[PDB]
Design a protein around this ligand. Structure first.
Ligand SMILES: *[C@@H]1O[C@H](CO)[C@@H](O[C@@H]2O[C@H](CO)[C@@H](O)[C@H](O)[C@H]2NC(C)=O)[C@H](O)[C@H]1NC(C)=O
Ligand SMILES: *[C@@H]1O[C@H](CO)[C@@H](O[C@@H]2O[C@H](CO)[C@@H](O)[C@H](O)[C@H]2NC(C)=O)[C@H](O)[C@H]1NC(C)=O
Ligand SMILES: *[C@@H]1O[C@H](CO)[C@@H](O[C@@H]2O[C@H](CO)[C@@H](O)[C@H](O)[C@H]2NC(C)=O)[C@H](O)[C@H]1NC(C)=O
Ligand SMILES: *[C@@H]1O[C@H](CO)[C@@H](O)[C@H](O)[C@H]1NC(C)=O
Ligand SMILES: *[C@@H]1O[C@H](CO)[C@@H](O)[C@H](O)[C@H]1NC(C)=O
Ligand SMILES: *[C@@H]1O[C@H](CO)[C@@H](O)[C@H](O)[C@H]1NC(C)=O
Ligand SMILES: *[C@@H]1O[C@H](CO)[C@@H](O)[C@H](O)[C@H]1NC(C)=O
Ligand SMILES: *[C@@H]1O[C@H](CO)[C@@H](O)[C@H](O)[C@H]1NC(C)=O
Ligand SMILES: *[C@@H]1O[C@H](CO)[C@@H](O)[C@H](O)[C@H]1NC(C)=O
Ligand SMILES: *[C@@H]1O[C@H](CO)[C@@H](O)[C@H](O)[C@H]1NC(C)=O
Ligand SMILES: *[C@@H]1O[C@H](CO)[C@@H](O)[C@H](O)[C@H]1NC(C)=O
Lengths: 29, 49, 48, 382, 276, 48, 48
């Protein structure tokens, strides 16, 4: 499994989503 | 792959402060370098997948 | 610096005296960012 | 516009096909609010500064100033201001801060001894009469008092400590009258190797300016935002919720939206800090309300171009933000990058990567051309 | 300063374990579901505290224990009593009129806190007695003879402390922490009901009670006990001053680093003594 | 700093004047440690 | 406590060596208008 996250997001630190969603990785597999 | 992160120097260092941002301009292109490195890491994560 | 909050330093000092604290904070936070990015680069090499 | 920002980021007039993290968007505060307590009774600065009698320097008079509004404009009225040295605080900002407490150390010294009243100083007065701490924060006000602390026959009511075994510690008062002893022979009275530590000033009007009596008041502050207490004269304004504002809670300055909080503060707790020591909630000085503070919406701004030779059109991704908050920010012109891209209603799409404006979401699937994220890509097509 | 002749018993200082008691709130910041590392003056876990008894015997000998104790960096005081025999404390360096002294006293209607060069008696105490066999009330004549050059006075906290009764055991586990930091005399307190008789094992953070900015030098302290002029023990015809049963423990604060656990509710529920 | 020995600086100056030299030494030695650890991380990646 | 002092342009240079430097004597015969110690803490002068 992947507030600390909100606090990180509150000072310039963001997390970018991956280009392939878990559904596409599952499709490939 | 690993988590792609993006960091804003102005917000992290001198968050919404004009005096601090003007002082930070005096350190050159350290943040252009940091942003470029992080962007490379993120594009590499997508490439890995 | 006297405090870790930029708003506090800006509110408690004139600009000429504030720049010293602002510069201490800038140096520390620049170092922290540089360390984070270097560790991320090494870790991304391992993950690649 | 976004394409020009892309060109300036790349430092080139020619842009290739791709998505470029151009800048950062921030929604801007709409109003500024200040919350200050009930207090309206002015601080008794006149009593301390205009006292009929001042204590001796070795027995400096300590006065407590708390639970009052500290209007420092009164200080400018009855003082020629020979010395107004504020250490650790800008004097011109003294009307804008809240201090936990005020300590007024009032005494009388010689004119040339004013410079000794400062941290790190050395001298008879500094070492044996009154020593300031190394990290002292506050102000020091010195003004001549020859017309009130001098006598024709000599004012001997003022005494200073000239000899002591050890230098005085910060905020330490010595009133002992034990005769100073030089060496190991005990002292039973005035004589060899025995001197009285206290020496009378003997202020006289005929003396020079450097020897004239000077009244010195040291205002010691403790700048902590938890106890608040004494602040300057700012008129508190109304409180607005669910709107990104510049808030000033008893000297604590910040920007964000203040919302109703379910957090239950124990009666002694004044504010809350997140796990990484960021202020998360605050207490209203007036309504005793627990307000959650959330920073105004911000994020990255990427520009998707099909190449500057193919076309000059661009799309804009506001990363990690709902399209509704972005639209509200445009409708109230709060967004920081003010080159708003024209929206047609079909121009706005909600990705998991953020809000996309300027691209039309078709229901077909193609090979990825410009990767936007979360399974979404963009291309220049008919 | 008149003290009727008593067969006073020399104070005997027993010893016992502090367990995990003495943890307070270091600051006024609210935290939720967090683990906070804090360096502060704490009572170390399983510390080794002094135990004193204040009782009147059945043979006429009354243990009126009010010895003068050092303060050091701070003091943790724990008390169990039924008639509020413990009424306050005195703090100072020489405990005379030469130097300013602090005095906290229960007025039985309010709480008095004074900072003056008090002329304390040899063994200051509060005189509780029964006027007209109708009104029980307290007097401070036995504490000090005169007060001069007063700098701080505070009459506040109109609280009778123990009011629910003596259900479990006096329901009066009074825990206090006294500190002197930057001229601030800080009193933290907690009124824990006792599941048992003396010093139950458990955890209970001490919420701050009052932070007085007295700004005076304190090195020594002493407990104050209330003496009632007879008519406390039914069936006893001995016309004389008598004191109820009370027990109090004293521990000393030291600079320790603690890992405190704030639950989602803002309260400290557990603590770890890093150097134990 | 005036000297590279902490005991010397502590013996020759009052605290307010000593902190400047102590901070110069802290900055230099922090930088040296950071450089050592970064080089070790890169070398350990190569060895892995 | 010399009877005669040389002129400022011809300042008198004296060599002090091979003796114990007790600086408590300096406090006896001096009003100490200025006691500025540069590079050394004066209160530590008895320890070096
Ligand atoms: C320092 O002097 C001030 C006055 O300049 C004193 O403040 C007075 O304190 C008394 C205490 O009984 C009050 O009744 C007065 O109202 C106060 N004000 C004045 C103007 O007299 C203060 O107590 C002195 N402090 C010390 C430590 O001596
Ligand atoms: C924190 O305090 C809240 C509010 O008092 C507690 O929530 C209550 O819990 C009890 C026991 O289950 C319920 O009967 C109430 O309805 C709850 N009130 C609410 C949800 O508003 C909560 O239990 C406390 N947390 C603890 C003690 O860990
Ligand atoms: C500076 O003056 C001191 C005295 O204040 C001189 O020291 C004397 O030197 C002579 C040399 O013959 C000795 O005999 C004396 O004993 C020394 N002491 C005194 C108190 O006279 C010193 O020589 C002078 N230096 C210069 C360069 O002129
Ligand atoms: C200073 O002025 C105040 C305000 O008028 C007055 O009450 C006080 O007596 C004065 N003190 C003197 C003249 O010493
Ligand atoms: C200030 O006054 C208001 C009423 O005007 C009151 O409700 C509030 O509690 C006061 N603030 C305090 C006591 O901090
Ligand atoms: C955008 O806001 C709406 C209404 O508040 C909400 O339902 C929706 O989940 C939000 N979008 C995302 C992607 O969470
Ligand atoms: C407690 O103090 C006593 C004094 O008798 C000593 O024997 C014992 O070792 C001490 N215990 C601790 C835990 O310090
Ligand atoms: C406080 O009083 C004690 C006992 O008289 C003394 O040793 C100590 O130095 C005093 N502290 C200060 C800061 O004056
Ligand atoms: C105790 O309280 C009474 C009122 O209940 C008050 O008049 C008195 O001044 C207080 N202090 C004493 C008796 O020392
Ligand atoms: C109070 O202050 C006065 C005036 O300085 C002084 O003479 C006296 O000794 C002090 N103490 C008492 C107990 O009066
Ligand atoms: C200074 O004092 C010394 C020691 O008594 C003495 O020898 C010397 O002559 C004095 N110098 C003068 C008075 O100029």
């Amino acid at each position: 499994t992947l507030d600390l996250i909100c606090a990180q997001k509150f000072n310039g630190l963001t997390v970018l989503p991956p280009l392939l969603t878990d559904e596409m990785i599952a499709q490939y597999t | 792959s690993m988590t792609k992160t993006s960091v804003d120097c102005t917000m992290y260092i001198c968050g919404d402060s004009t005096e601090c941002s003007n002082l930070l301009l005096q350190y050159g292109s350290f943040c252009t370098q940091l942003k470029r490195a992080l962007t490379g890491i993120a594009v590499e994560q997508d490439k890995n997948t | 610096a006297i405090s870790s909050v930029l708003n506090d330093i800006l509110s408690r000092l004139d600009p000429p005296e504030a720049e010293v604290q602002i510069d201490r904070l800038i140096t520390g936070r620049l170092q922290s960012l540089q360390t984070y990015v270097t560790q991320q680069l090494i870790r991304a090499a391992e993950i690649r | 516009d976004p394409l020009s920002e892309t060109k300036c980021t790349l430092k080139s007039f020619t842009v290739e096909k791709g998505i470029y993290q151009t800048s950062n968007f921030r929604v801007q505060p709409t109003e500024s609010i200040v919350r200050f307590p009930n207090v309206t009774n002015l601080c008794p600065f006149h009593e301390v500064f205009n006292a009929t009698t001042f204590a001796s320097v070795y027995a400096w008079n300590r006065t407590r100033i708390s639970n009052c509004v500290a209007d420092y404009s009164v200080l400018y009225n009855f003082a020629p201001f020979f010395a107004f040295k504020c250490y650790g605080v800008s004097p011109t900002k003294l009307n804008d801060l809240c201090f936990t407490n005020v300590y007024a150390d009032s005494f009388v010294i010689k004119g040339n001894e004013v410079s000794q009243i400062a941290p790190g100083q050395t001298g008879n007065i500094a070492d044996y009469n009154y020593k300031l701490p190394d990290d002292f924060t506050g102000c020091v006000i010195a003004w001549n008092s020859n017309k009130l602390d001098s006598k024709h026959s000599g004012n001997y009511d003022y005494w200073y400590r000239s000899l002591r075994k050890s230098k005085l510690k910060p905020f330490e008062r010595d009133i002992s009258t034990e005769i100073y002893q030089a060496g190991n022979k005990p002292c039973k009275g005035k004589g060899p190797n025995c001197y009285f530590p206290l020496q009378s000033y003997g202020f006289r009007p005929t003396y020079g300016v450097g020897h004239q009596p000077y009244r010195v008041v040291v205002l010691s502050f403790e700048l902590l935002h938890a106890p608040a207490t004494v602040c300057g004269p700012k008129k508190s304004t109304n409180l607005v919720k669910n709107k990104c504002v510049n808030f000033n809670f008893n000297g604590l300055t910040g920007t964000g939206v203040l919302t109703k909080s379910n957090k239950k503060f124990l009666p002694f707790q004044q504010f809350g800090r997140d796990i990484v020591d960021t202020t998360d909630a605050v207490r209203d000085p007036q309504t005793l309300e627990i307000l959650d503070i959330t920073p105004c919406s911000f994020g990255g701004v990427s520009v998707i171009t099909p190449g500057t030779n193919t076309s000059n059109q661009v799309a804009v991704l506001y990363q990690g933000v709902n399209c509704t908050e972005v639209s509200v920010a445009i409708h109230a012109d709060q967004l920081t990058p003010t080159w708003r891209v024209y929206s047609t209603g079909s121009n706005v799409f909600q990705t998991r990567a953020g809000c996309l404006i300027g691209a039309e979401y078709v229901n077909n699937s193609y090979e990825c051309d410009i990767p936007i994220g979360a399974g979404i890509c963009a291309s220049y097509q008919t | 300063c008149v003290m009727p002749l008593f067969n006073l018993i020399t104070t005997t200082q027993s010893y016992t374990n502090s367990f995990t008691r003495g943890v307070y709130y270091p600051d006024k910041v609210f935290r939720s579901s967090v683990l906070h590392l804090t360096q502060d003056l704490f009572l170390p876990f399983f510390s080794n505290v002094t135990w004193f008894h204040a009782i009147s015997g059945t043979n006429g000998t009354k243990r009126f224990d009010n010895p003068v104790l050092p303060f050091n960096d701070g003091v943790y005081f724990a008390s169990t009593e039924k008639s509020n025999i413990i009424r306050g404390w005195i703090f100072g360096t020489t405990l005379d009129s030469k130097t300013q002294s602090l005095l906290i006293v229960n007025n039985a209607t309010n709480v008095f806190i004074k900072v003056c060069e008090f002329q304390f008696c040899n063994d200051p105490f509060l005189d509780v007695y029964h006027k007209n066999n109708k009104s029980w009330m307290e007097s401070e004549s036995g504490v000090y003879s005169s007060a001069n050059n007063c700098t701080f006075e505070y009459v506040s906290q109109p609280f009778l402390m123990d009011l629910e009764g003596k259900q479990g055991n006096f329901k009066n586990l009074r825990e206090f922490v006294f500190k002197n930091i930057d001229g601030y005399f800080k009193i933290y307190s907690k009124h824990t009901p006792i599941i048992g008789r003396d010093f139950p094992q458990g955890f209970s953070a001490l919420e701050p009670l009052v932070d007085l900015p007295i700004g005076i030098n304190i090195t020594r302290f002493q407990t104050l006990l209330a003496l009632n002029r007879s008519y406390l023990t039914p069936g006893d015809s001995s016309s004389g001053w008598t004191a109820g049963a009370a027990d109090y423990y004293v521990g000393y604060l030291q600079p320790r680093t603690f890992l405190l656990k704030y639950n989602e509710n803002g309260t400290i529920t557990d603590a770890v003594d890093c150097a134990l």
